[PDB]
Symmetry: C3
Subunit: 314 residues, 3 copies
């Protein structure tokens, strides 16, 4: 086995909409823990993190809810490190993507040599000074990059943060909605990425080959997969805050995750931005939840060609 | 010409739902025979097979309606051999997929060296002892494989059966819902298959190249194409009994069939699992029927780049 | 810069439906000129062409509204040449595709060495004698080809026409509804084309590589992109007169245009067949208009990986 350590992170202060807080709930109600155990997985639920209320949390310049988001990630980082110290793959059922700051930070405490694969329609690499929205769920990567140390002002709630990954330790997959400042950072730091243009050009097969070769070429290491459900096309994951057309297909999403699993190096996983209250219909909500579940199950073994135990079936 | 021998097989006792019996009807009402003749095809309709009612047909262990399904295939095998002896490509408009037992058996009587391409979300290779559902439409392949001789118990209605194909004579395309026992059989017999994972990785172009090279590499031979409409994605063929998301696209389905046609070796064809009463709307029914028709027309020449007679059009 | 010269062509007499005349309007109302200026583009609107009414325009044999379509293109050709003489890329917001006769003709007056990329589900290469519908929007290519000189009868309204392109100067992308006579012409003149079969086989990446290499292999030259919105799948562009299933995806359409832009050789562009009154719902209309806009923006720079000015963002 690989073992799994489930972490519910019902948090939404990284952006405007509060429904993202139900992510852990509807995902759990979909039978995630059960379907995982139905597989060759040993699951341990660490519960839903209790994020205290920070009443006094006025914006920092344009940055909104800094202390709340800062504390939420600091809290999450501690939990993730713990489960990692327990020899399990951390699975964060999230609210908004700002939690990746804590998820990747906690993970790196135990595996500083980790590599990150970021599935998303966005790069979430805006800094507290380049952001136009001020929503922290669009800035997690800037806080984690060591090269961006010096460009990140002292934002309340984030003094505990220590950039743990370098520009060369991350690969983007699915980009199609990147701001100008974010694009400048991409090219300036020489960050490796496969926007939808590259997926269209090479095919998901070549994309994954290159992504894994890029991160595991020099040597094998722990992999942290940060999956934003809007990385996929909205026809598959509509109940999300920032949908963008022309996304990855259900198939490509399952292909990305099946290949990650096969490396046997998955160490940390984030399933983020699932907002049940944003589904235009109860059918769109189930579609989003069911797709999110399928993606997660694939990260832990579930193969489309089929699976079977080391037993003589005939 | 190639000539075509149409065989209506309004049968449903291979599974629970009875609406699959209307397959031949709605397909014919869609204008199949007419659209085929509109092409460079010489069509001969052998009518709809009259499957007698077997009132006394209690389950065999967990296997349901064994005698009914057994007689239906025995009946179909005879018809298929006849049309094959008449020098025509047999086209079975089916009910459920259990009829493939009779379709491939009858075909092999006249062309024992045939090769099979099985388009489906499922492998339908469960044996009477490995099945959990007991529905025979999920077991046709086990009855036909010579390697599985000895694992198939004596089921009522199937004493006439003689496995005609070896593990090496078949290729699967589109798999994404395979049971554990079925997966064990796949790997144990070294069966050639392209699950959706392989389609995603290689592209339908490479998949077909390899499939045809695999079956016609050593030498040219008759090809039997067994097409289960659920092999395609449900957004294209919703009116079907066992839909699974992440299927082949309308394009890939047309690509598979266009390439098969171009081999000039198509010998037998099955269009199965079309259930009009399962369409959530009359629009989903037409969508399923129209897609099923398009796939069939492509099997006999209809090319997307266009077609034209050996005449000077200018 | 590249500069852009916008030309509204509210014309519909190339086919039955009149709603195509609103193309320029709804496209403009979508914010096209604004979104373009928001980019690195210098836009100049040349207004909407005033196509006089031709009351006396009885069919020529089977050809309908010949004088009206003939005058509309003659009018458009003059405008296009002008904007080209002004050093700008001509962008024709069209009605029906018959306007391509004038668009490509006017363009060639200033750049006789141009190469054409025709995105469409159809070849629109029927001649006035091979057409079965008589709608001129399905015949534009025959009027422009020099090889077809002698096969084009003297149709009223077209005496000003002079074929400007040879069979070797054009590439088709997206074909899936080609008539027999049209297919004969394709093969007879050895026209280069990528029907949906080739897109499926090679992938859009290889298709574009080959298309551009084919047209710019011997030397660099101006490119005229004639984009029929039905080239894309109807799930993306439903509000169109002749929809055909199995079309290019939103992604492939954006890939085609992003690659064209990157050549830095785009010289002329047509956005045709957008008919707002054909949307089954107001949502299908926005879907068509929004997709049409996205395709156009990509033709002028908008990249999915992101864009940014030559400024230090940090
Ligand atoms: N770049 C926009 C969108 C960010 C979207 C964030 B995400 O990926 O977490 O949903 C912003 O900075 O606000
Ligand atoms: N493996 C399941 C599903 C079989 C589905 C059958 B089919 O492909 O014919 O629709 C069963 O054995 O019952
Ligand atoms: N080939 C048919 C259809 C032409 C469709 C024209 B189009 O591409 O401009 O919409 C006809 O000649 O009428
Ligand atoms: Mn996102
Ligand atoms: Mn994100
Ligand atoms: Mn099936
Ligand atoms: Mn089947
Ligand atoms: Mn067209
Ligand atoms: Mn056209």
């Amino acid at each position: 086995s690989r073992t799994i350590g489930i972490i519910g992170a019902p948090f939404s202060k990284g952006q405007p909409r509060g429904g993202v807080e139900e992510g852990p709930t509807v995902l759990r109600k979909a039978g995630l823990l059960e379907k995982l155990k139905e597989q060759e997985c040993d699951v341990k639920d660490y519960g839903d993190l209790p994020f205290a209320d920070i009443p006094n949390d006025s914006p920092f310049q344009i940055v909104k809810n800094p202390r709340s988001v800062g504390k939420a990630s600091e809290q999450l980082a501690g939990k993730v490190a713990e489960v990692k110290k327990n020899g399990r793959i951390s699975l964060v059922l999230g609210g908004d993507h700002s939690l990746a700051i804590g998820s990747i930070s906690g993970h790196a405490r135990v595996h500083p040599d980790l590599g990150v694969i970021w599935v998303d329609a966005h790069t979430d690499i805006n800094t507290p000074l380049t952001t136009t929205s001020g929503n922290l769920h669009g800035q997690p990567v800037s806080f984690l990059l060591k090269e961006l140390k010096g460009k990140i002002p002292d934002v309340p709630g984030f003094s505990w943060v220590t950039p743990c990954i370098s520009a060369k330790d991350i690969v983007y997959i699915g980009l199609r909605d990147v701001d100008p400042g974010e694009h400048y950072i991409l090219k300036t730091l020489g960050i490796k990425y496969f926007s939808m243009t590259e997926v269209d050009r090479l095919g998901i097969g070549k994309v994954m080959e290159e992504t894994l070769s890029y991160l595991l070429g020099r040597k094998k290491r722990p992999i942290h997969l940060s999956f934003d459900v809007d990385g996929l096309d909205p026809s598959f994951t509509p109940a999300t805050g920032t949908p963008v057309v022309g996304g990855l297909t259900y198939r490509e999403g399952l292909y990305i995750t099946e290949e990650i699993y096969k490396t046997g190096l998955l160490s940390g996983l984030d399933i983020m931005e699932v907002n049940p209250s944003l589904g235009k219909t109860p059918e769109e909500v189930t579609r989003t939840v069911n797709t999110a579940v399928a993606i997660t199950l694939a990260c832990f073994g579930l193969a489309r060609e089929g699976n079977h135990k080391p037993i003589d079936y005939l």
